[PDB]
Amino acid sequence: WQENKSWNAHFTEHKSQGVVVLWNENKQQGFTNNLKRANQAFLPASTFKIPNSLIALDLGVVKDEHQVFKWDGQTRDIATWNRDHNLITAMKYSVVPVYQEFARQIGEARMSKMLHAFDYGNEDISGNVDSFWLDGGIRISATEQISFLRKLYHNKLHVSERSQRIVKQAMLTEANGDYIIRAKTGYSTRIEPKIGWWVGWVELDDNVWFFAMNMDMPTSDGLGLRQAITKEVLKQEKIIP
Amino acid sequence: WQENKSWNAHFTEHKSQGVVVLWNENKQQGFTNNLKRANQAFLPASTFKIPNSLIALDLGVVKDEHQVFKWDGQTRDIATWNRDHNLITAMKYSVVPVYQEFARQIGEARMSKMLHAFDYGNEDISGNVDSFWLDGGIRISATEQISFLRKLYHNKLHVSERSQRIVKQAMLTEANGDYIIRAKTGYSTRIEPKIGWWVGWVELDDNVWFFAMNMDMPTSDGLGLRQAITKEVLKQEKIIP
Ligand SMILES: O=C(O)c1cccc(-c2cccnc2)c1
Ligand SMILES: O=C(O)c1cccc(-c2cccnc2)c1
Ligand SMILES: [Cl-]
């Protein structure tokens, strides 16, 4: 590991504070602006939709990425949630209610065994089965996010290869002639400190860089900074043009 | 099918000639600027790397999307061909020599066998086993490209689901918050008429539009028009912003 305190400027300039963690797969070397915060554990919030998808697919709770989960007819504050969804759109729009039903069908016992099986975070599902990743006892750090994402990339998680391919398809966020990003955002508000996540990796012709960032998020006005700050660290380190 | 000659303006502006074919999956309706050229069968050229990849993967010639295929040391006119590749990069750069090695190991019989199962074009592989899609007898029209792609999208081709998922990953071309494009380019130069291809689909939240276009290509200077003209039609039809 190598600490690069010059990156703190990227958070300072937007009157913010947070951590970005990078991992060079080819060289097996990591980088962060803050070794301390890189190992501090936060609620995963909607970043939990990755393992939640893996478990639901492997158990048959979700048949495939085409299965439609109909809106329950309850009007919610986020308009894009008030409609039918499949796996791709449910993760694109971070549709909490869809994944809360997943959790209720997966059940306490199978969820716990799988998270220990994944070595995910502190592997503690204490709380309510349908919201513990939002206000329960589960916690995970940025460096731990990267360890989990690296296994997903290599199809090393203890679920089928098919489940890992579908979830990685669902994680597709951005793609052009220069790079491919697969990631998931997160926004934790029910427990202090309020933070936003962005975890995933960038695929190049001859390498993959894994990343995991979290930052203070006192208001929803700053959510766009999750991607904005991350990409700047990538540009600075010459990972993306 | 419905003919929309107003699209011809997009070809005329760039002193070009060609066809674009679109298919609305939800509504099971097709649209094109030239019904006749839409059903005209040409050499597939590098669009053939879709079926070829499916065959190589299903037969074990290709293990997975990470397997490395060494450069043979022959300096060729296209710089990106003079290096090592995997399935992802081999298609991104239309690396002919990599896929000719696939064909040689697939063999004449198994290739003919598979294309019949795919109902691909005229199913005629006459010529060299490793160049028939470049200067052999195989022929396929734009409408037939879409019919074949529709089976791939729905995992209905007679190869494993795994093979079809991998090829759909390797077809990834562009992705943003508004759409995803999985497609493949083509460039037929060895036999007249010289044309360029672009075939695939654009994934939206609530629908999928399949597309297949070809145009006259007397010189390599106009290759970039394949994507440009297609997108102008997509913008006009309000499919992409
Ligand atoms: O960005 C996210 O991951 C996410 C997930 C759930 C809810 C929200 C959210 C909640 C309230 C306002 N704006 C966004 C964001
Ligand atoms: O764009 C293509 O699909 C493609 C495929 C194979 C070869 C070529 C090509 C051929 C000659 C010069 N420049 C590019 C283009
Ligand atoms: Cl993909």
CSV table of C-alpha atoms in Angstrom, one decimal, chain B:
chain,number,residue,atom,x,y,z
B,1,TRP,CA,-42.4,-3.7,-42.2
B,2,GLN,CA,-42.7,0.0,-42.9
B,3,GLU,CA,-40.6,2.1,-45.3
B,4,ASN,CA,-39.4,5.6,-44.2
B,5,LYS,CA,-37.5,7.2,-47.1
B,6,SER,CA,-36.9,10.4,-45.1
B,7,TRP,CA,-33.9,8.7,-43.6
B,8,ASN,CA,-32.3,8.8,-47.1
B,9,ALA,CA,-31.3,12.4,-46.3
B,10,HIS,CA,-28.8,11.2,-43.7
B,11,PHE,CA,-27.0,9.2,-46.4
B,12,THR,CA,-27.3,11.9,-49.1
B,13,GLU,CA,-25.7,14.5,-46.9
B,14,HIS,CA,-22.5,12.5,-46.7
B,15,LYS,CA,-22.5,11.6,-50.4
B,16,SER,CA,-23.2,8.0,-49.4
B,17,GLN,CA,-25.5,5.2,-50.2
B,18,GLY,CA,-26.8,2.5,-47.9
B,19,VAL,CA,-29.6,1.1,-45.7
B,20,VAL,CA,-30.5,1.1,-42.0
B,21,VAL,CA,-33.0,-1.4,-40.6
B,22,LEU,CA,-34.6,-1.0,-37.2
B,23,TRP,CA,-36.7,-3.5,-35.2
B,24,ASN,CA,-38.9,-2.5,-32.2
B,25,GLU,CA,-39.0,-5.6,-30.0
B,26,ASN,CA,-42.0,-4.5,-27.8
B,27,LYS,CA,-44.2,-3.8,-30.8
B,28,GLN,CA,-42.7,-6.5,-33.2
B,29,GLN,CA,-42.4,-4.0,-36.0
B,30,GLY,CA,-39.6,-3.1,-38.3
B,31,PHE,CA,-38.6,0.1,-40.0
B,32,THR,CA,-36.2,0.9,-42.9
B,33,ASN,CA,-35.4,3.4,-45.6
B,34,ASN,CA,-35.0,0.8,-48.3
B,35,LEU,CA,-37.1,-2.3,-48.2
B,36,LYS,CA,-35.2,-3.8,-51.1
B,37,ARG,CA,-31.6,-3.3,-49.9
B,38,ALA,CA,-32.7,-4.3,-46.5
B,39,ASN,CA,-33.3,-7.8,-47.9
B,40,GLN,CA,-30.2,-7.8,-50.1
B,41,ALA,CA,-27.6,-10.4,-49.0
B,42,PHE,CA,-23.9,-9.4,-48.8
B,43,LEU,CA,-20.8,-10.9,-47.4
B,44,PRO,CA,-20.9,-10.4,-43.6
B,45,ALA,CA,-17.1,-9.6,-43.3
B,46,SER,CA,-16.3,-8.8,-39.6
B,47,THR,CA,-19.9,-9.0,-38.5
B,48,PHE,CA,-19.2,-12.7,-38.7
B,49,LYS,CA,-17.2,-12.5,-35.6
B,50,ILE,CA,-20.4,-12.8,-33.6
B,51,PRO,CA,-21.3,-16.2,-34.9
B,52,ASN,CA,-17.7,-17.2,-35.0
B,53,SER,CA,-17.1,-16.3,-31.4
B,54,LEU,CA,-20.2,-18.2,-30.3
B,55,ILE,CA,-18.9,-21.3,-32.1
B,56,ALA,CA,-15.3,-21.1,-30.8
B,57,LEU,CA,-16.6,-20.7,-27.2
B,58,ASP,CA,-19.2,-23.5,-27.4
B,59,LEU,CA,-16.5,-25.9,-28.9
B,60,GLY,CA,-13.8,-25.1,-26.3
B,61,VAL,CA,-11.5,-23.5,-28.9
B,62,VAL,CA,-11.8,-20.4,-26.6
B,63,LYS,CA,-11.9,-21.1,-22.9
B,64,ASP,CA,-13.2,-17.7,-21.7
B,65,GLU,CA,-12.9,-14.0,-22.3
B,66,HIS,CA,-9.5,-13.8,-20.6
B,67,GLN,CA,-7.6,-16.4,-22.7
B,68,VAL,CA,-4.7,-14.8,-24.4
B,69,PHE,CA,-4.0,-15.4,-28.1
B,70,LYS,CA,-0.3,-14.7,-28.9
B,71,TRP,CA,0.8,-12.4,-31.7
B,72,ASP,CA,2.4,-14.6,-34.4
B,73,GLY,CA,5.1,-12.0,-35.2
B,74,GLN,CA,3.9,-11.1,-38.6
B,75,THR,CA,3.8,-7.3,-39.1
B,76,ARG,CA,0.5,-6.4,-40.7
B,77,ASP,CA,-0.8,-3.1,-41.9
B,78,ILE,CA,-3.1,-2.5,-39.0
B,79,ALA,CA,-1.0,-1.7,-35.9
B,80,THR,CA,-3.5,-2.9,-33.3
B,81,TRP,CA,-3.3,-6.4,-34.9
B,82,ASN,CA,0.5,-6.7,-34.1
B,83,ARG,CA,0.1,-7.5,-30.4
B,84,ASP,CA,-1.5,-10.1,-28.0
B,85,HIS,CA,-5.3,-10.2,-27.7
B,86,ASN,CA,-8.2,-11.8,-25.8
B,87,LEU,CA,-11.8,-12.3,-27.0
B,88,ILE,CA,-12.7,-8.8,-25.8
B,89,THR,CA,-9.9,-6.9,-27.6
B,90,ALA,CA,-9.8,-9.2,-30.6
B,91,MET,CA,-13.4,-8.1,-31.5
B,92,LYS,CA,-12.9,-4.5,-30.4
B,93,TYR,CA,-10.1,-4.2,-33.0
B,94,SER,CA,-11.6,-6.6,-35.6
B,95,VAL,CA,-8.5,-8.7,-35.4
B,96,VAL,CA,-8.9,-11.0,-38.4
B,97,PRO,CA,-5.8,-13.3,-37.9
B,98,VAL,CA,-7.1,-14.3,-34.4
B,99,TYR,CA,-10.4,-15.4,-35.8
B,100,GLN,CA,-8.9,-17.2,-38.7
B,101,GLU,CA,-7.1,-19.4,-36.2
B,102,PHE,CA,-10.4,-20.0,-34.6
B,103,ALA,CA,-12.0,-21.1,-37.9
B,104,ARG,CA,-9.0,-23.4,-38.7
B,105,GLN,CA,-9.5,-25.2,-35.4
B,106,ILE,CA,-13.3,-25.2,-35.7
B,107,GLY,CA,-12.9,-27.0,-39.1
B,108,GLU,CA,-15.0,-26.9,-42.2
B,109,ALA,CA,-17.6,-29.5,-41.1
B,110,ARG,CA,-18.3,-28.0,-37.6
B,111,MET,CA,-18.6,-24.5,-39.1
B,112,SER,CA,-21.1,-25.6,-41.8
B,113,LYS,CA,-22.8,-27.6,-39.1
B,114,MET,CA,-23.2,-24.6,-36.7
B,115,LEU,CA,-24.3,-22.0,-39.3
B,116,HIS,CA,-27.1,-24.3,-40.3
B,117,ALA,CA,-28.2,-24.5,-36.7
B,118,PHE,CA,-28.1,-20.7,-36.5
B,119,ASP,CA,-30.1,-20.4,-39.7
B,120,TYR,CA,-27.4,-17.8,-40.6
B,121,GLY,CA,-27.7,-16.2,-44.0
B,122,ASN,CA,-27.5,-18.6,-46.9
B,123,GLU,CA,-25.5,-21.0,-44.7
B,124,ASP,CA,-22.9,-21.4,-47.5
B,125,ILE,CA,-19.2,-21.6,-46.3
B,126,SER,CA,-17.7,-22.4,-49.7
B,127,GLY,CA,-14.2,-21.1,-49.9
B,128,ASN,CA,-11.3,-21.3,-47.4
B,129,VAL,CA,-12.4,-22.3,-43.9
B,130,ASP,CA,-10.5,-19.3,-42.6
B,131,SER,CA,-11.7,-16.6,-45.0
B,132,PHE,CA,-15.1,-17.6,-46.4
B,133,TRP,CA,-16.8,-14.7,-44.6
B,134,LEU,CA,-14.3,-12.3,-46.4
B,135,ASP,CA,-14.2,-13.7,-49.9
B,136,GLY,CA,-16.3,-16.9,-49.9
B,137,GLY,CA,-19.9,-17.7,-50.6
B,138,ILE,CA,-21.7,-16.8,-47.4
B,139,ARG,CA,-24.3,-14.1,-47.8
B,140,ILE,CA,-26.6,-12.4,-45.3
B,141,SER,CA,-29.0,-9.4,-45.5
B,142,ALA,CA,-29.7,-6.7,-42.9
B,143,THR,CA,-33.1,-8.1,-42.0
B,144,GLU,CA,-31.4,-11.6,-41.5
B,145,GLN,CA,-28.8,-10.0,-39.3
B,146,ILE,CA,-31.6,-8.7,-37.0
B,147,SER,CA,-33.4,-12.1,-37.0
B,148,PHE,CA,-30.1,-13.7,-35.9
B,149,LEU,CA,-29.4,-11.0,-33.3
B,150,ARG,CA,-32.8,-11.4,-31.8
B,151,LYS,CA,-32.1,-15.0,-31.0
B,152,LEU,CA,-28.8,-14.1,-29.4
B,153,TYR,CA,-30.5,-11.4,-27.2
B,154,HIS,CA,-33.0,-14.0,-26.0
B,155,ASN,CA,-30.4,-16.8,-25.5
B,156,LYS,CA,-32.3,-18.8,-28.1
B,157,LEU,CA,-29.4,-19.9,-30.3
B,158,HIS,CA,-28.4,-23.6,-30.1
B,159,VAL,CA,-25.3,-23.0,-28.0
B,160,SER,CA,-24.9,-22.8,-24.3
B,161,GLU,CA,-26.3,-19.8,-22.4
B,162,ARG,CA,-22.8,-19.2,-21.1
B,163,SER,CA,-21.4,-18.8,-24.7
B,164,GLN,CA,-24.2,-16.4,-25.6
B,165,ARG,CA,-23.6,-14.3,-22.4
B,166,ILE,CA,-19.9,-14.0,-23.1
B,167,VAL,CA,-20.4,-13.0,-26.7
B,168,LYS,CA,-22.9,-10.4,-25.7
B,169,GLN,CA,-20.3,-9.0,-23.2
B,170,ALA,CA,-17.7,-8.9,-25.9
B,171,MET,CA,-20.1,-7.0,-28.2
B,172,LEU,CA,-20.3,-4.1,-25.7
B,173,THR,CA,-19.7,-0.9,-27.6
B,174,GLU,CA,-21.2,2.0,-25.7
B,175,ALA,CA,-23.1,2.6,-22.4
B,176,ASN,CA,-24.3,5.6,-20.5
B,177,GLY,CA,-27.2,6.7,-18.3
B,178,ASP,CA,-29.5,6.7,-21.4
B,179,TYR,CA,-28.7,3.6,-23.4
B,180,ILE,CA,-26.4,0.6,-24.0
B,181,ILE,CA,-25.2,-0.5,-27.4
B,182,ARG,CA,-24.0,-4.0,-28.1
B,183,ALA,CA,-22.9,-4.2,-31.8
B,184,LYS,CA,-20.2,-5.2,-34.3
B,185,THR,CA,-18.7,-3.4,-37.3
B,186,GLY,CA,-17.8,-4.9,-40.6
B,187,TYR,CA,-15.8,-3.9,-43.7
B,188,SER,CA,-15.9,-6.0,-46.9
B,189,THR,CA,-13.1,-5.1,-49.3
B,190,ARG,CA,-11.9,-8.3,-51.1
B,191,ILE,CA,-15.0,-8.7,-53.4
B,192,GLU,CA,-17.2,-6.1,-54.9
B,193,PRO,CA,-19.3,-4.3,-53.9
B,194,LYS,CA,-17.2,-2.8,-51.0
B,195,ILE,CA,-19.5,-2.1,-48.1
B,196,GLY,CA,-19.4,-1.4,-44.4
B,197,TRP,CA,-21.6,-3.0,-41.7
B,198,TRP,CA,-22.9,-2.1,-38.3
B,199,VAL,CA,-25.3,-4.5,-36.6
B,200,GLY,CA,-26.6,-4.9,-33.0
B,201,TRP,CA,-29.1,-3.4,-30.7
B,202,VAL,CA,-29.7,-0.5,-28.3
B,203,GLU,CA,-31.0,-1.4,-24.8
B,204,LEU,CA,-33.4,1.1,-23.1
B,205,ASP,CA,-35.1,0.9,-19.8
B,206,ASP,CA,-38.4,-0.4,-21.1
B,207,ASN,CA,-37.6,-1.7,-24.6
B,208,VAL,CA,-34.8,-2.9,-27.0
B,209,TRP,CA,-34.3,-1.7,-30.6
B,210,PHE,CA,-32.3,-4.0,-32.9
B,211,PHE,CA,-30.5,-2.4,-35.8
B,212,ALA,CA,-28.6,-3.5,-38.9
B,213,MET,CA,-27.0,-1.1,-41.5
B,214,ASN,CA,-24.8,-1.4,-44.5
B,215,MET,CA,-23.5,1.2,-46.9
B,216,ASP,CA,-21.2,1.5,-49.9
B,217,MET,CA,-17.5,1.9,-48.9
B,218,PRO,CA,-15.2,2.6,-51.8
B,219,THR,CA,-12.5,3.9,-49.5
B,220,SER,CA,-11.6,3.4,-45.9
B,221,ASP,CA,-11.9,7.2,-45.3
B,222,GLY,CA,-15.7,6.8,-44.8
B,223,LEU,CA,-15.7,4.0,-42.2
B,224,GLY,CA,-16.7,6.4,-39.4
B,225,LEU,CA,-20.0,7.1,-41.2
B,226,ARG,CA,-21.3,3.6,-40.2
B,227,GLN,CA,-21.9,4.7,-36.6
B,228,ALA,CA,-22.6,8.4,-37.4
B,229,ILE,CA,-25.4,7.7,-39.9
B,230,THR,CA,-27.0,5.0,-37.7
B,231,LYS,CA,-27.1,7.4,-34.7
B,232,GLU,CA,-28.7,10.2,-36.7
B,233,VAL,CA,-31.5,7.8,-37.5
B,234,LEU,CA,-31.7,6.8,-33.9
B,235,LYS,CA,-31.8,10.5,-32.8
B,236,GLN,CA,-34.5,11.3,-35.4
B,237,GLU,CA,-36.7,8.5,-34.1
B,238,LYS,CA,-36.1,9.7,-30.5
B,239,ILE,CA,-34.6,6.4,-29.5
B,240,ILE,CA,-31.5,8.0,-28.1
B,241,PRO,CA,-31.0,11.6,-27.0
